[PDB]
Amino acid sequence: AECKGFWKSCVPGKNECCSGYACSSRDKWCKVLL
């Protein structure tokens, strides 16, 4: 099963993004550590 990316749309509490990525409910998108 594939996983979210960096620009994908995710929800808070789910963290569908791949390991190392964070979720932001502010814009409901994915995040990546600089």
From Swiss-Prot:
Compartment annotation: Secreted
Entry note about domains: The presence of a 'disulfide through disulfide knot' structurally defines this protein as a knottin.
Tissue: Expressed by the venom gland.
Family to which the UniProt record says this protein belongs: Belongs to the neurotoxin 10 (Hwtx-1) family. 14 (Hntx-1) subfamily.
Section of the entire sequence shown: 49 to 81 of 83
Job description of the protein: Weakly blocks the rat SCN2A/SCN1B (Nav1.2/beta-1) sodium channel (IC(50)=68 uM) and the insect sodium channel para/tipE (IC(50)=4.3 uM), without altering the activation or inactivation kinetics (depressant toxin).
Top-level taxon of the source organism: Eukaryota
Protein name as it appears in the record: Mu-theraphotoxin-Hhn2b 3
Organism: Cyriopagopus hainanus (Chinese bird spider)
Description of how the protein assembles with itself and partners: Monomer.
Miscellaneous comment: Negative results: has no effect on mammalian SCN3A/SCN1B (Nav1.3/beta-1), SCN4A (Nav1.4), SCN5A/SCN1B (Nav1.5/beta-1), and SCN9A/SCN1B (Nav1.7/beta-1). Has also no effect on sodium subtypes in rat DRG neurons containing Nav1.1/SCN1A, Nav1.6/SCN8A, Nav1.7/SCN9A, Nav1.8/SCN10A and Nav1.9/SCN11A.
Modified residues (Leucine amide): L34
Coiled coil spans: none
Cystine bridges: C3-C18, C10-C23, C17-C30
Spans traversing the lipid bilayer: none
